[PDB]
Tab-separated table of C-alpha atoms and ligand atoms in Angstrom:
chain	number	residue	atom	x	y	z
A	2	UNK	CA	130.694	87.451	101.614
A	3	UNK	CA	129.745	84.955	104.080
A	4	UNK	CA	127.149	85.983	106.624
A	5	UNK	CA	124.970	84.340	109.855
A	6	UNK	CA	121.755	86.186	108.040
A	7	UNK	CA	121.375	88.159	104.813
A	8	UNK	CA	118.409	90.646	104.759
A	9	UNK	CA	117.062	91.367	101.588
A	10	UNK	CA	115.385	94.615	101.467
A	11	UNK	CA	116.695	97.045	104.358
A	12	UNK	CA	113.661	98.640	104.152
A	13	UNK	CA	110.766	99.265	107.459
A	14	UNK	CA	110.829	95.527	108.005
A	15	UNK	CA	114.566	94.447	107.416
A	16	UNK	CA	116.375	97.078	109.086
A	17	UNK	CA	113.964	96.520	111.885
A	18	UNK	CA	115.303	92.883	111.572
A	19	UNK	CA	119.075	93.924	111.093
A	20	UNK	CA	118.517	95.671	114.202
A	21	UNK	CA	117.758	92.999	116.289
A	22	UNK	CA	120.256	90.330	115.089
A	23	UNK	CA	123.163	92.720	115.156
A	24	UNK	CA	121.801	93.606	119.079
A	25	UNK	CA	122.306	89.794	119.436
A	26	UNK	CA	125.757	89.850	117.662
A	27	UNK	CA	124.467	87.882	114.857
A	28	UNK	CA	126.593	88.645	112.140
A	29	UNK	CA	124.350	90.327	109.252
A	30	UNK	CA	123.965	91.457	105.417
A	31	UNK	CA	121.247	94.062	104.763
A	32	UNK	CA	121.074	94.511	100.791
A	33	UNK	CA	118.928	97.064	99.279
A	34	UNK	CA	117.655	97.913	95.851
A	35	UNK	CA	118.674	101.698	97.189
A	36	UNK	CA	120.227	104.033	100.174
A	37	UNK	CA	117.561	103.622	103.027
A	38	UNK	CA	115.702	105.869	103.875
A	39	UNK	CA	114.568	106.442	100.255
A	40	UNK	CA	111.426	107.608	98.836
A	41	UNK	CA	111.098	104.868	95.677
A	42	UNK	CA	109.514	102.130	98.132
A	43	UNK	CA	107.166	102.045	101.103
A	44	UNK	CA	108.445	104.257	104.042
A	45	UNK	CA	108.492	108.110	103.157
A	46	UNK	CA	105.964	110.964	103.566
A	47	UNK	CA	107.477	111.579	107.170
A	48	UNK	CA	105.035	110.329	109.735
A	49	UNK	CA	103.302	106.773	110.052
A	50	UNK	CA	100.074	106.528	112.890
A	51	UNK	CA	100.871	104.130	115.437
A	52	UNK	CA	97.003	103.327	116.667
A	53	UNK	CA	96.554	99.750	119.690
A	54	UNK	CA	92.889	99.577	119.506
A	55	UNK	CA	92.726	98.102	116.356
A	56	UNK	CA	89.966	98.298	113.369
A	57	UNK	CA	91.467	95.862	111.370
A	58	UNK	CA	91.281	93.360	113.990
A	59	UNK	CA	91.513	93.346	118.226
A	60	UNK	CA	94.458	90.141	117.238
A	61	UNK	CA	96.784	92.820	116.351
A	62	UNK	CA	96.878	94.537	119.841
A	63	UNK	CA	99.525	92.527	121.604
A	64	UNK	CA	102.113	93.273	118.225
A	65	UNK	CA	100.663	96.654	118.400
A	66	UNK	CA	101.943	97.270	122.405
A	67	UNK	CA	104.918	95.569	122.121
A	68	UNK	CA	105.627	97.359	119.070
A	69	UNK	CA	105.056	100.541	121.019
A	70	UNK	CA	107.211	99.985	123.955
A	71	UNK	CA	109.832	99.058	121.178
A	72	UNK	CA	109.598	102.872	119.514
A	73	UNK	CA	109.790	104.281	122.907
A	74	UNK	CA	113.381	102.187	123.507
A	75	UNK	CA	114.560	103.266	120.388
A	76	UNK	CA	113.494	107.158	121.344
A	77	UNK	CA	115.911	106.481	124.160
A	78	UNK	CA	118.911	104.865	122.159
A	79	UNK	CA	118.830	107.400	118.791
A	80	UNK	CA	119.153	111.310	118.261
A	81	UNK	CA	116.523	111.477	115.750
A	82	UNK	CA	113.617	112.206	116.996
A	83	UNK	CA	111.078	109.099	116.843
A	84	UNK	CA	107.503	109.365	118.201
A	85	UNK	CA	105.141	112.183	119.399
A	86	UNK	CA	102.127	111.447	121.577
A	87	UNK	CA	99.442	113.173	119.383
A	88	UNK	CA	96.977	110.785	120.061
A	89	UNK	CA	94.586	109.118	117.295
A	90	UNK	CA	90.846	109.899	116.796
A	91	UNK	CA	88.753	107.212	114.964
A	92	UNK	CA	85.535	108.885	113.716
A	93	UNK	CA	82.250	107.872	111.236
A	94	UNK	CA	78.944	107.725	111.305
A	95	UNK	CA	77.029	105.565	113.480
A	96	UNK	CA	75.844	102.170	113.017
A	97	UNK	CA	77.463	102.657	109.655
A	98	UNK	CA	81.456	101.613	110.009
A	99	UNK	CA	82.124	98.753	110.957
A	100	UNK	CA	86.241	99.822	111.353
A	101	UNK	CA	84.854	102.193	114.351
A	102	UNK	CA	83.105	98.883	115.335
A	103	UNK	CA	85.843	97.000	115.852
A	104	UNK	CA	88.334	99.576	117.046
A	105	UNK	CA	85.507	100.094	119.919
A	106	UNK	CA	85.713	96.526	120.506
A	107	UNK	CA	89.300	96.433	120.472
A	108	UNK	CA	89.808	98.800	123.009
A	109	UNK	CA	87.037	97.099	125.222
A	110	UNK	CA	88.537	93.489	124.947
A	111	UNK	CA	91.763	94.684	125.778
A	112	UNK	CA	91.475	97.819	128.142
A	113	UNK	CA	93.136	100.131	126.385
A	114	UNK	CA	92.114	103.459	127.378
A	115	UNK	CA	90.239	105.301	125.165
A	116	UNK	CA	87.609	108.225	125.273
A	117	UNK	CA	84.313	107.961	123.386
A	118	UNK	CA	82.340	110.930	121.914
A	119	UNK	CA	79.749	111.940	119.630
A	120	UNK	CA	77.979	114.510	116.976
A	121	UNK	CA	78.900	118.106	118.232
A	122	UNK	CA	81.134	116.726	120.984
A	123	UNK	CA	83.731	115.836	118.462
A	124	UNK	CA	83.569	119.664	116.946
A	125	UNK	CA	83.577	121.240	120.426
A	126	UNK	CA	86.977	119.364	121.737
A	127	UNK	CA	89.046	120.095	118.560
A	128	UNK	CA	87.676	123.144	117.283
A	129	UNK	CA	88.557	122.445	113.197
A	130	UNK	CA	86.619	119.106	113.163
A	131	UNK	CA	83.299	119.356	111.609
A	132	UNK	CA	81.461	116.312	111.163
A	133	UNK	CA	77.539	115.444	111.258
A	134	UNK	CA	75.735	115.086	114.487
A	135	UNK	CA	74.875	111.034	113.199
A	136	UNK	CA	78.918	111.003	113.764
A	137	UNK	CA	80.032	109.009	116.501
A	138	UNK	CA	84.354	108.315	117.523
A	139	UNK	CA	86.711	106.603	119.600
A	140	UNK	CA	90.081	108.606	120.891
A	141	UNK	CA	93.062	107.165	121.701
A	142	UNK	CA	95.077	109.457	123.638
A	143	UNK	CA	98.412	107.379	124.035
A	144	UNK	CA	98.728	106.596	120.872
A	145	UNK	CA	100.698	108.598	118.056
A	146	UNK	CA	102.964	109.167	115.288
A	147	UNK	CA	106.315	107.937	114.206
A	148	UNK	CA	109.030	109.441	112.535
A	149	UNK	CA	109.197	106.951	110.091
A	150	UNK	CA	112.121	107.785	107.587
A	151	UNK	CA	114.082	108.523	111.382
A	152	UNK	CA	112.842	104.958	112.523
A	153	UNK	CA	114.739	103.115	109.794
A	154	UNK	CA	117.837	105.167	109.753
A	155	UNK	CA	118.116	105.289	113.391
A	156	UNK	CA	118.112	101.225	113.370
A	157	UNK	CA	120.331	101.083	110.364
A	158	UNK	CA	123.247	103.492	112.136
A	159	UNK	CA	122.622	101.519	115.413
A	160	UNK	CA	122.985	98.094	113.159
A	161	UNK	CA	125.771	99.120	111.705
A	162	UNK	CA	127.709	100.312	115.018
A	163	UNK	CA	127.389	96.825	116.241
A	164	UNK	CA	128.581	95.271	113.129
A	165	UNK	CA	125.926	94.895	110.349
A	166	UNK	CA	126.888	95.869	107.133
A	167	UNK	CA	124.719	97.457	104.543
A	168	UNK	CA	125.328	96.688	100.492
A	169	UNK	CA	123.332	100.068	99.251
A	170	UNK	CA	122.562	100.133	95.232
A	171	UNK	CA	121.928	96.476	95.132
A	172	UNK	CA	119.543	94.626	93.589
A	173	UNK	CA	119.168	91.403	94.341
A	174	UNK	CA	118.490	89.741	91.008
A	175	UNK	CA	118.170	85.989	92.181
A	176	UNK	CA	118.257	83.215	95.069
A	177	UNK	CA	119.598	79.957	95.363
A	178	UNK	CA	118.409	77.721	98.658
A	179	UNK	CA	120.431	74.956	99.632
A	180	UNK	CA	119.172	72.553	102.697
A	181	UNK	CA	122.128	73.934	105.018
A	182	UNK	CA	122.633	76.986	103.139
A	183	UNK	CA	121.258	80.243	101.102
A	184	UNK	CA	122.552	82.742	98.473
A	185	UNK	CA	121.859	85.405	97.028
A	186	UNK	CA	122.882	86.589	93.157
A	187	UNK	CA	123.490	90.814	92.428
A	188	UNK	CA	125.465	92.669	90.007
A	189	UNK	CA	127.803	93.322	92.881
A	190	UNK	CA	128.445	90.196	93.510
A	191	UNK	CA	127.081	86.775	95.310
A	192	UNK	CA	126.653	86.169	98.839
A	193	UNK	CA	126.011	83.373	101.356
A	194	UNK	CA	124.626	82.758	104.363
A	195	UNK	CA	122.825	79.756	107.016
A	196	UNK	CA	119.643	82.189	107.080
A	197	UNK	CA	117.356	84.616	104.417
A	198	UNK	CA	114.945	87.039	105.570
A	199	UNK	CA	113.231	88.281	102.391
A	200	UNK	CA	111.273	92.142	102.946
A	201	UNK	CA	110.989	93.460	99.900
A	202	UNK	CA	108.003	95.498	100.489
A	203	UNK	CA	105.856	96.121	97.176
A	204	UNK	CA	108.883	93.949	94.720
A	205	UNK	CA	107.525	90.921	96.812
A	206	UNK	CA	104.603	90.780	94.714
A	207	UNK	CA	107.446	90.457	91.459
A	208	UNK	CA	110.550	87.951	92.706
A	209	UNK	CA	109.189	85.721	95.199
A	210	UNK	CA	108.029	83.850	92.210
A	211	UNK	CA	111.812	83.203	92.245
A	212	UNK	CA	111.991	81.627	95.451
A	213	UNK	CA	109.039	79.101	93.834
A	214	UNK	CA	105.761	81.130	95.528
A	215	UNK	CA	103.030	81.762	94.086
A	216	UNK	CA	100.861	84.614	96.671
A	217	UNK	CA	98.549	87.138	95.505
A	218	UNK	CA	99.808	90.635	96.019
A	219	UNK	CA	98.842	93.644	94.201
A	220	UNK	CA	101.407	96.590	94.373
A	221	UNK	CA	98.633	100.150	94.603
A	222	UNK	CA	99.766	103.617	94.615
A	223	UNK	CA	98.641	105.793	97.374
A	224	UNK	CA	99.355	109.451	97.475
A	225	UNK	CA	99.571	111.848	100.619
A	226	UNK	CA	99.282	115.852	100.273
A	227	UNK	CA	100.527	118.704	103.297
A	228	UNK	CA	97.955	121.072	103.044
A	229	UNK	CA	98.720	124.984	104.687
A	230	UNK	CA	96.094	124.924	107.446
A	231	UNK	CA	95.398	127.527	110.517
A	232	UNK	CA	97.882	126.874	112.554
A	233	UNK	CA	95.417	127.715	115.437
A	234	UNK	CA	93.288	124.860	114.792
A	235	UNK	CA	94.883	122.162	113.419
A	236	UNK	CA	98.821	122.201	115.074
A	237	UNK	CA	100.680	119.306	117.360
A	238	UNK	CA	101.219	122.151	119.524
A	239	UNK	CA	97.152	122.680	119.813
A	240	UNK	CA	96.554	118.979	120.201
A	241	UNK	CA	95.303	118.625	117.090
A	242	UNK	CA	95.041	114.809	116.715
A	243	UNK	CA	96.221	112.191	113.999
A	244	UNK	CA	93.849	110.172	112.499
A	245	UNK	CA	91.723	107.503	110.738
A	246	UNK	CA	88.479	108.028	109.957
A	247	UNK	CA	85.248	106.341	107.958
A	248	UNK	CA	82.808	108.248	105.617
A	249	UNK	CA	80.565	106.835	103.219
A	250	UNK	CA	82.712	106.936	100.261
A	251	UNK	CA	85.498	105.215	102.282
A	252	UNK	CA	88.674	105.402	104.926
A	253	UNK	CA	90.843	108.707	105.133
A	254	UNK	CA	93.637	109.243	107.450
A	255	UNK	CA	96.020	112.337	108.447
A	256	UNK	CA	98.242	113.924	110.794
A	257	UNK	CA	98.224	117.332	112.650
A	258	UNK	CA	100.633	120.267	111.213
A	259	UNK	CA	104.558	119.781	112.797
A	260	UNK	CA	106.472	123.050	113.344
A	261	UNK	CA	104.044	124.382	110.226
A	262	UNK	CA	104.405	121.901	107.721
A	263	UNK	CA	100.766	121.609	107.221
A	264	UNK	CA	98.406	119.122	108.021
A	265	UNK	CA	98.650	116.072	105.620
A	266	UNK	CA	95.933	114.006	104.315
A	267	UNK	CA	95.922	110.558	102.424
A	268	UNK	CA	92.758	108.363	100.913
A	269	UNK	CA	92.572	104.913	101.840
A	270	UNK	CA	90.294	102.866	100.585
A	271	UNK	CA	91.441	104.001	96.887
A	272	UNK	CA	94.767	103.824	94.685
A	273	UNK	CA	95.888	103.100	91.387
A	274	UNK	CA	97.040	99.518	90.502
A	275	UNK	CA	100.483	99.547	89.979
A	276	UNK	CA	104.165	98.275	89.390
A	277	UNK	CA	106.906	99.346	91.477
A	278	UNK	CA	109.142	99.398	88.647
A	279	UNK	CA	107.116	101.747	86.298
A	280	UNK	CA	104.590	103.411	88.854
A	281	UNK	CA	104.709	107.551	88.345
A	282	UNK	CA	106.167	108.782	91.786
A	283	UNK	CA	105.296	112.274	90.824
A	284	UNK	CA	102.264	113.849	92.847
A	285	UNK	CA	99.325	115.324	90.788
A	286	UNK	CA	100.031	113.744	87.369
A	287	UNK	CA	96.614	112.156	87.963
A	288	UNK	CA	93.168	114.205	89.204
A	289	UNK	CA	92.804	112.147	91.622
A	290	UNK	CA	95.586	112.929	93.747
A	291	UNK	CA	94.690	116.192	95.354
A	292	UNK	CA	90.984	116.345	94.307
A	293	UNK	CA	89.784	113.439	96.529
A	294	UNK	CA	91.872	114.893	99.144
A	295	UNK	CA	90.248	118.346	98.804
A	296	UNK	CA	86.811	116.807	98.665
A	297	UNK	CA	87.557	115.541	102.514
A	298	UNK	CA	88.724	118.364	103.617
A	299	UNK	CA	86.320	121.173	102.408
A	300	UNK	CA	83.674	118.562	104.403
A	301	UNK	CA	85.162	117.440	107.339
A	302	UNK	CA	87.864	119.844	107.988
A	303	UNK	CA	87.636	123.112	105.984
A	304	UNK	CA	90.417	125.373	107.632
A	305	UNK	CA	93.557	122.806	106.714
A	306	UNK	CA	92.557	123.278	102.833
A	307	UNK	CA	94.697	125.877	101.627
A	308	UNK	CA	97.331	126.040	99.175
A	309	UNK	CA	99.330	121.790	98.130
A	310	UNK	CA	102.505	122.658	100.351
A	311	UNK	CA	103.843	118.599	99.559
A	312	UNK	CA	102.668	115.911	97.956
A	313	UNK	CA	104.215	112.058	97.985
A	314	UNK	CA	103.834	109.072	96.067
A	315	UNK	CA	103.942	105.855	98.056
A	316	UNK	CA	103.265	102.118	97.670
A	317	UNK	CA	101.165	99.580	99.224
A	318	UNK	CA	101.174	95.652	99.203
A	319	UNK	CA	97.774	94.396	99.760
A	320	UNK	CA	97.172	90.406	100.077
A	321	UNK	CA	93.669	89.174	99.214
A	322	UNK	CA	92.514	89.563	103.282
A	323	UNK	CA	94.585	92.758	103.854
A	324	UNK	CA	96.447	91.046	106.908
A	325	UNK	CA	100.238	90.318	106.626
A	326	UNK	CA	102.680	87.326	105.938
A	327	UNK	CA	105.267	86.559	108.393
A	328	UNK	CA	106.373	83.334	108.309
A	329	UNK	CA	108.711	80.485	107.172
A	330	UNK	CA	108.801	79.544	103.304
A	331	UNK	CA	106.753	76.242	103.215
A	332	UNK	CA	109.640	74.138	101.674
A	333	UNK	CA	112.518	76.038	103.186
A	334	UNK	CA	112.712	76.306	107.133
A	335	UNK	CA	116.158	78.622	106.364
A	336	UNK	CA	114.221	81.489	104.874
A	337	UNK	CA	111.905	83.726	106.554
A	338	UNK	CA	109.414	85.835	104.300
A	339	UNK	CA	108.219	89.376	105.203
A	340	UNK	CA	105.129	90.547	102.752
A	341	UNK	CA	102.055	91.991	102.249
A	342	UNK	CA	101.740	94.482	104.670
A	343	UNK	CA	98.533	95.979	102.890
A	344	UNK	CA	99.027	99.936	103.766
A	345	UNK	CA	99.140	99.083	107.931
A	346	UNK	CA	102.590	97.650	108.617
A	347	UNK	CA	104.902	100.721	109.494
A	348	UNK	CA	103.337	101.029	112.945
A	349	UNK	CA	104.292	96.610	113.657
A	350	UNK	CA	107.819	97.465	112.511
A	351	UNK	CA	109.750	97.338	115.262
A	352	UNK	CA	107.592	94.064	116.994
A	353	UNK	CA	108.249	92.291	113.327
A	354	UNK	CA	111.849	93.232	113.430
A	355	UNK	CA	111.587	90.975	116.618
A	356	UNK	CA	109.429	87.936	115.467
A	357	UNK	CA	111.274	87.928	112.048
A	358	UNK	CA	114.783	87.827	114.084
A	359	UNK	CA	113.502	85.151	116.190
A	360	UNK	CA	111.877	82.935	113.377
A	361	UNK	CA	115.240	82.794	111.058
A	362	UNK	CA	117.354	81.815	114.374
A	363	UNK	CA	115.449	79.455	116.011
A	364	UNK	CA	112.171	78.602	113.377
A	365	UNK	CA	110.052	79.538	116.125
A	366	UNK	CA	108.776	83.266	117.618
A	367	UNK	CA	107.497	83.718	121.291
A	368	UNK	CA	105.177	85.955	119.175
A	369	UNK	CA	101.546	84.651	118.447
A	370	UNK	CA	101.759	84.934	114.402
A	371	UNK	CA	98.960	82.378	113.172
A	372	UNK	CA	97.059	85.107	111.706
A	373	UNK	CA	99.756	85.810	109.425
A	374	UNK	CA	100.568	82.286	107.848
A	375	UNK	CA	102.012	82.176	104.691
A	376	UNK	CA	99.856	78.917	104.411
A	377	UNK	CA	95.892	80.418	104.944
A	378	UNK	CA	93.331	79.761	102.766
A	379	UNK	CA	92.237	83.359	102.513
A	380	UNK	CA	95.449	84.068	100.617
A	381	UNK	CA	94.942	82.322	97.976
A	382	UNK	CA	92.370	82.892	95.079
B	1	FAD	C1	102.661	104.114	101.244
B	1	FAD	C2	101.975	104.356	102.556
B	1	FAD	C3	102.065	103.377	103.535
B	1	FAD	C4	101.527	103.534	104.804
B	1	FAD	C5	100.865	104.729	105.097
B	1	FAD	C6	100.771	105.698	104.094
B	1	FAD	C7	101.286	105.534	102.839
B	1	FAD	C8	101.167	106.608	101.787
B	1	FAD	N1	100.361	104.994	106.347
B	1	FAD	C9	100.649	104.128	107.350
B	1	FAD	C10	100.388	104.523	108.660
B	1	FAD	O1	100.039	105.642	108.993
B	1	FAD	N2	100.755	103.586	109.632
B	1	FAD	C11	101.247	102.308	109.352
B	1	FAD	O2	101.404	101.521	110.307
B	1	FAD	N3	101.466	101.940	108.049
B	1	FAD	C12	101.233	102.835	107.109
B	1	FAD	N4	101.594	102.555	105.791
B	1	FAD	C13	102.127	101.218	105.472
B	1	FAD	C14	103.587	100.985	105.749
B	1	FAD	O3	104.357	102.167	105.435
B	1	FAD	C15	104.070	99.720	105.040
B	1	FAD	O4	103.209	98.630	105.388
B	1	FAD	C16	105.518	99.379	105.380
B	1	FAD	O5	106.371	100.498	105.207
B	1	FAD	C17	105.971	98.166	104.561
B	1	FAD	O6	107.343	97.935	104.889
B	1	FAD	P1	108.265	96.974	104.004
B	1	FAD	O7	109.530	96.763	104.770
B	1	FAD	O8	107.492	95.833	103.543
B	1	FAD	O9	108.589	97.904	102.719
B	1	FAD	P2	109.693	98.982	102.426
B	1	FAD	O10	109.904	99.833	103.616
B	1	FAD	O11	109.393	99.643	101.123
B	1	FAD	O12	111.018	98.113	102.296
B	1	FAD	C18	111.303	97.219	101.188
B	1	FAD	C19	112.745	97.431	100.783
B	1	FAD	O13	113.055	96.394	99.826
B	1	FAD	C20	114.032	96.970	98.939
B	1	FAD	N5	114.127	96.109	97.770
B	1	FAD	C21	113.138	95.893	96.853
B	1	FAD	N6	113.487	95.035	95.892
B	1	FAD	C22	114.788	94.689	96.237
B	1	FAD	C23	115.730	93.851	95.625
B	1	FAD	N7	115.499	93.160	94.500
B	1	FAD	N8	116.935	93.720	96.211
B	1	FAD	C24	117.144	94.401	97.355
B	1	FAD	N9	116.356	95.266	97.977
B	1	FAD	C25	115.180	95.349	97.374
B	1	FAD	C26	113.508	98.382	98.714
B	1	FAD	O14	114.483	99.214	98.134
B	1	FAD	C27	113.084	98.801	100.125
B	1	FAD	O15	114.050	99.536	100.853
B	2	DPR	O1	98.107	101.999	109.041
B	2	DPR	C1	97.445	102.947	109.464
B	2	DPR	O2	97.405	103.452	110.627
B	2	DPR	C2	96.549	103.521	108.375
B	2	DPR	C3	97.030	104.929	108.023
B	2	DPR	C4	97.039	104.935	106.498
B	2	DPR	C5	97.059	103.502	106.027
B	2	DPR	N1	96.707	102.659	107.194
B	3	CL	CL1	102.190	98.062	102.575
């Protein structure tokens, strides 16, 4: 019951984490809430985009390649299958988003290799596509998809083969932070360590208030669909790519069809406020859910619109700037927080599995992480 770390929340970030300090055979607690992989937080639905040149911002792009080269070790070390090549197309009209913008510029500052096309070039190369000839896109051919329910359970069986142990079922229910010291209070008992790492993905925004923070983060339910689609058109095996697109009423983002599973579809830019502990995780109990999906698809791609093979109900954390929190807790240089991750973290999970390993052993990260201080002024209100 004494540990080097505990991890609370052994979720996309913290079993990333668990990962690296067991690696470093730094003796570690994971506790979760539930059994990860589970579907009642932030990592289900199957597949996660991985994109490097970056529309949120070109600063993500070295987290983004080391993150990468991360997801192709673990391909190496696991069984379950981890990443697939599909490549990501980034697509709106021109002049008119400024997401393409900056992915454009992303890819120039840093020369990633991208191709760039327009209007009736998009339709031609992936026959399925059918946008406007005002339409212009970026492609990203080395980019991809993760496995992302594989990701965290291939870390958590490699954790736990080197020695990390795993409390399942557990909710942590309170913390108590001594200068030279931390503990944690559950039902199942208390524990104790010289380090916290707190990733509790969308229950941040609910019991960091316990560890005496005060951050703005709203908990939003976002819904995906798997929609049966010509196989012809719109399959992995066709090079059908994944992507994340702008149209004028907002961001969309999907994934080719996988051994027929359809190709899936989720909105963006819109989701229901919620919180985690009462949100409906049941697909189509609101209009919403398929209809805005549908209303892409009849548009943009009108073959992958048949019959709702899947839906799935899944959370994000936004802050008030949409970029993350990684850092140390102001008053307590023993505790490393984890938050925020604002519906773009999966792909970074592996890279903040490193910096967050790094910051709880030695307060410091080789990583450049000033974007994501837990002490900006655009966090606050
Ligand atoms: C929901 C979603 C997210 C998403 C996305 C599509 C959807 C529908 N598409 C993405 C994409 O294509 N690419 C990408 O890079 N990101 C994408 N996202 C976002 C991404 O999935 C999230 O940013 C990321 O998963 C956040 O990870 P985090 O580690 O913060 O969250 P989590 O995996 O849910 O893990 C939190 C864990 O904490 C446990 N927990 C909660 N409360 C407690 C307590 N009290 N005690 C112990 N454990 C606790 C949870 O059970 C969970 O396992
Ligand atoms: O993180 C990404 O790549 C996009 C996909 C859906 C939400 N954010
Ligand atoms: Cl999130």
């Amino acid at each position: 019951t004494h540990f080097d770390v505990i991890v609370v929340g052994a979720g996309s970030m913290g079993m990333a984490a668990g990962y690296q300090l067991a690696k470093q055979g730094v003796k570690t607690l994971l506790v979760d809430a539930f059994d990860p992989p589970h579907t009642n937080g932030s990592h289900h639905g199957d597949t996660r985009i991985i994109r490097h040149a970056y529309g949120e911002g070109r600063e993500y792009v070295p987290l983004a390649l080391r993150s990468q080269e991360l997801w192709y070790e673990l391909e190496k070390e696991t069984h379950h299958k981890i990443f697939t090549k599909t490549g990501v197309l980034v697509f709106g009209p021109k002049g008119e988003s400024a997401f393409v913008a900056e992915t454009m510029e992303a890819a120039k500052e840093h020369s990633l290799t991208v191709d760039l096309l327009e209007g009736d070039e998009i339709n031609k190369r992936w026959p399925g596509i059918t946008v406007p000839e005002n339409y212009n896109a970026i492609f990203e051919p080395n980019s991809g998809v993760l496995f992302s329910e594989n990701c965290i359970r291939a870390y958590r069986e490699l954790a736990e083969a080197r020695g990390a142990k795993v409390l399942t079922h557990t909710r942590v229910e309170d913390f108590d932070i001594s200068p030279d010291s931390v503990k944690i209070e559950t039902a199942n008992g208390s524990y104790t360590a010289d380090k916290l790492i707190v990733s509790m993905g969308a229950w941040n925004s609910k019991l960091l208030s316990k560890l005496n923070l005060d951050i703005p983060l709203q908990p939003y339910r976002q819904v995906v669909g798997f929609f049966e689609s010509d196989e012809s058109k719109y399959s992995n095996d066709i090079d059908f790519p994944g992507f994340m697109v702008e149209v004028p009423n907002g961001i969309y983002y999907g994934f080719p069809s996988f051994g027929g599973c359809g190709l899936k579809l989720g909105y963006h830019t819109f989701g229901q406020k919620i919180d985690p502990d009462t949100i409906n995780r049941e697909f189509g109990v609101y209009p919403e859910d398929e209809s805005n999906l549908r209303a892409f698809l009849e548009e943009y791609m009108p073959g992958a619109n048949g019959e709702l093979k899947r839906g799935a109900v899944c959370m994000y954390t936004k802050t008030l700037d949409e970029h993350f929190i990684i850092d140390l807790h102001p008053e307590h240089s023993n505790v490393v927080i984890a938050a925020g991750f604002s519906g773009h973290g999966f792909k970074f999970s592996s890279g903040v599995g490193e910096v967050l390993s790094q910051l709880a052993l030695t307060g410091k990260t080789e990583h450049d992480i000033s974007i994501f201080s837990i002490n900006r002024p655009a966090l606050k209100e």
